[PDB]
Design a protein around this motif. Sequence first.
Motif, mmCIF file in Angstrom:
data_model
loop_
_atom_site.group_PDB
_atom_site.id
_atom_site.type_symbol
_atom_site.label_atom_id
_atom_site.label_comp_id
_atom_site.label_asym_id
_atom_site.label_seq_id
_atom_site.Cartn_x
_atom_site.Cartn_y
_atom_site.Cartn_z
ATOM 1 N N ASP A 158 42.980 59.484 52.818
ATOM 2 C CA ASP A 158 42.842 58.426 53.851
ATOM 3 C C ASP A 158 43.921 58.900 54.862
ATOM 4 O O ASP A 158 45.175 58.568 54.610
ATOM 5 N N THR A 172 50.248 52.565 56.781
ATOM 6 C CA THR A 172 50.219 51.960 58.062
ATOM 7 C C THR A 172 51.332 50.870 58.213
ATOM 8 O O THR A 172 51.951 50.279 59.191
ATOM 9 N N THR A 207 37.455 50.924 55.044
ATOM 10 C CA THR A 207 37.265 50.166 53.699
ATOM 11 C C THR A 207 35.759 50.644 53.167
ATOM 12 O O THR A 207 35.896 50.397 51.783
ATOM 13 N N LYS A 241 42.636 53.513 64.670
ATOM 14 C CA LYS A 241 44.099 53.694 64.770
ATOM 15 C C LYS A 241 44.585 54.692 65.705
ATOM 16 O O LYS A 241 45.342 54.337 66.785
ATOM 17 N N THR A 298 38.716 45.965 60.214
ATOM 18 C CA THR A 298 38.710 45.980 61.636
ATOM 19 C C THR A 298 37.057 45.941 61.794
ATOM 20 O O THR A 298 36.481 46.631 61.715
HETATM 21 C C1 LIG Z 1 43.597 49.934 58.981
HETATM 22 N N1 LIG Z 1 45.116 49.162 58.757
HETATM 23 C C2 LIG Z 1 45.318 48.393 59.923
HETATM 24 C C3 LIG Z 1 44.492 47.211 59.978
HETATM 25 O O1 LIG Z 1 44.852 46.261 59.039
HETATM 26 P P1 LIG Z 1 44.215 44.636 58.965
HETATM 27 O O2 LIG Z 1 44.782 43.678 59.934
HETATM 28 O O3 LIG Z 1 44.638 44.113 57.434
HETATM 29 O O4 LIG Z 1 42.662 44.956 59.014
HETATM 30 C C4 LIG Z 1 46.816 47.886 59.783
HETATM 31 O O5 LIG Z 1 47.214 47.106 60.651
HETATM 32 O O6 LIG Z 1 47.585 48.244 58.931
HETATM 33 C C5 LIG Z 1 43.588 51.097 57.615
HETATM 34 C C6 LIG Z 1 42.563 50.803 56.870
HETATM 35 C C7 LIG Z 1 41.316 49.991 56.965
HETATM 36 O O7 LIG Z 1 40.219 50.497 57.740
HETATM 37 P P2 LIG Z 1 39.153 49.520 58.500
HETATM 38 O O8 LIG Z 1 38.267 49.452 57.246
HETATM 39 O O9 LIG Z 1 39.586 48.295 58.973
HETATM 40 O O10 LIG Z 1 38.467 50.519 59.299
HETATM 41 C C8 LIG Z 1 42.458 51.933 55.833
HETATM 42 N N2 LIG Z 1 43.334 52.659 55.822
HETATM 43 C C9 LIG Z 1 44.648 52.764 56.518
HETATM 44 C C10 LIG Z 1 45.679 53.716 56.283
HETATM 45 C C11 LIG Z 1 44.610 51.889 57.530
HETATM 46 O O11 LIG Z 1 45.623 51.684 58.384
#
Ligand SMILES: *[C@H](N[C@@H](COP(=O)(O)O)C(=O)O)c1c(COP(=O)(O)O)cnc(C)c1O
Lengths: 360, 360
Positions: free
Chosen positions: B171, B151, B76, B195, A237
Amino acid sequence: ARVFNFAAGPATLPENVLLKAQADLYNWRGSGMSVMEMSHRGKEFLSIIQKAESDLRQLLEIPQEYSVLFLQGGATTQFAALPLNLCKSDDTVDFVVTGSWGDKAVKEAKKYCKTNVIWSGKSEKYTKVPSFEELEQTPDAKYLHICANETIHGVEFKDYPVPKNGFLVADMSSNFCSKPVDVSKFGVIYGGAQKNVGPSGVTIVIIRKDLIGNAQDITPVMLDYKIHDENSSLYNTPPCFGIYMCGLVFEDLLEQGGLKEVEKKNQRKADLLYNAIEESNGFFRCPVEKSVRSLMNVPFTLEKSELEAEFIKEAAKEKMVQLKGHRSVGGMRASIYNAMPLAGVEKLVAFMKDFQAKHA
Amino acid sequence: ARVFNFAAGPATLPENVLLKAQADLYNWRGSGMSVMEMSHRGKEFLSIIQKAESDLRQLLEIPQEYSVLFLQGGATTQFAALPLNLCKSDDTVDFVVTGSWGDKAVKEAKKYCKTNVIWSGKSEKYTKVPSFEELEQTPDAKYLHICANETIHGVEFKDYPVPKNGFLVADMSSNFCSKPVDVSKFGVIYGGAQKNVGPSGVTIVIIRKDLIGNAQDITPVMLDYKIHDENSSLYNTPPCFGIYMCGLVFEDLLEQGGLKEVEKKNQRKADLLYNAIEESNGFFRCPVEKSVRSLMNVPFTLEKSELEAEFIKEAAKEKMVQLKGHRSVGGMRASIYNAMPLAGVEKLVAFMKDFQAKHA
Ligand SMILES: *[C@H](N[C@@H](COP(=O)(O)O)C(=O)O)c1c(COP(=O)(O)O)cnc(C)c1O
Ligand SMILES: *[C@H](N[C@@H](COP(=O)(O)O)C(=O)O)c1c(COP(=O)(O)O)cnc(C)c1O
Ligand code: NA
């Protein structure tokens, strides 16, 4: 009323940019949501990040064979990302250190490769830029690293050294999009957005495409240029709102007439301040060698240094704030970025003239 | 009009919070500048980050002996920072993997230490949580990692395993501040803010103070917990505006009555959607085992899968957007975070009932 904000970063922003962001904050272009709520996988944000990239390419005349990455973590994260991406652990990086931000880059890079400081300004208190032909570069250095505008010390490159073996890398955080830059001379330009082009939370990396790839095994995925490039800065993100804000700033710089016009204004307002210092008959002092005086960050001291706290406090009462130097050096520092109104530098100059009359 | 925005992150935010930000954007509380122009070393921003921290501490009942860090880089980035800070390179980390976010954390940690996946839900398509007493934990594991709310797959921990040798790391990105959490059960809780608690650009790390320090020598300074802790998240320039927004969210969660009340509302609106699915006689399906069904992310599929594009298009035309599943799995996914109005879930449920009637 809004004050004249001389902060070095985060810093003052254009009023029309702030008002555009206010206008659209609840519902951006009838999308029914704020930029702060948009999916980074959706069509509205795509349009935003793509237009921010294209506007930035127009501003700096970035050639097509460069990528433009919008990343998190600040320029300080790039102090690690550069050697991790661009070097093997036994490669050497040459540094020219003209102030403390280049020194911080050296110390972080030591974790990841060999470093050679081929020139340091410290023996003359970081007031100068080396003669480049005199530089002794390392025959096998992967790249030559400079900090193009040393934000605390007020030393700015006005022309650039030619790397011998490898490519040139420049931390342009505090003069980013203040003037034209021949991007083709560089392998990498990077800078945090918050000094001169947006809110904090975004770092911009302009990197020659043939330099992307082959990061070290230990590089976190979030520091890997190939990962970011091949996902168009959407691997995880991204900082969506900060990228949007940078886009407003770039669009507005194009409307001002582009970086040649930006540089004209910066030169004009910086000349007013530097002339006032030079004409004060020693009352105010700037230690930096004339030819490398920054247009962005103007450090100056008082001959009666014990008067500096009164200067800073009375200036703030006059709605001119954040003029204290960086804590490492003390004294005063006027940061006069792109968005600092000309009328703010005029007010500081008139304040300085009045302060001297009253304490001389 | 604003839409009902079912995106998984970045995500929907409270309208009163967005409007508060809008009214203060040009000049925060008559201070003379935007939050976006404030120096991170000045008193206005200090007041903002300090209240955001204390409000979050109130909400989650965070014990004194834990630090709260507000960082850049996303969750991440924490996939690398956790083992870099908490492990030597020959230590071992246990993972319980309940979906693909846990799998991404394993792959990154393997760069920095040894990893044992002691349980994985992949063989049943990430639909269950293990029986904790039966888990086979590694005798010398430094810590046990879970993703509390997966998620993409809709699997949510309702209570937590007890780490055998070390401490628990979770997480909590996509259920952060959705409900009370006994923080004292954890060594580290972390989450991207985008989120459930703000815009993207901020990641929160809650870490027991005696676990801070002694990161691996290759740890980038920007990933080092002791650096961030000893500088109170102001080591470099922080994501000031995202921190401010997080603070507005936290303040409003307190005004709503705190996480006990937030959880009650989340349970209520999740129940409406889950009951609609179960009552649909197979027309809609949720694959997740009933006891671990997430309150935050609700993946579901159509028995007639060829209808999924029409479902999504008609929903959008009805101002319900971003209902397509994560691209790695397809289907539909209703994310129904704290700020998703009850009326939006009700509209979705009514639309689902009508859709089934029309495609019987
Ligand atoms: C964020 N998950 C979101 C975003 O997913 P992508 O479209 O693949 O980027 C989702 O739709 O499921 C998420 C993260 C990663 O966080 P960032 O590094 O982008 O801040 C890590 N853990 C969980 C539980 C997430 O939902
Ligand atoms: C940012 N320099 C600013 C802020 O310095 P601190 O108050 O010590 O944080 C200054 O006042 O001089 C800067 C950086 C660091 O970028 P971030 O990691 O914070 O994004 C790197 N290079 C240059 C040239 C900077 O000015
Ligand atoms: Na107001």
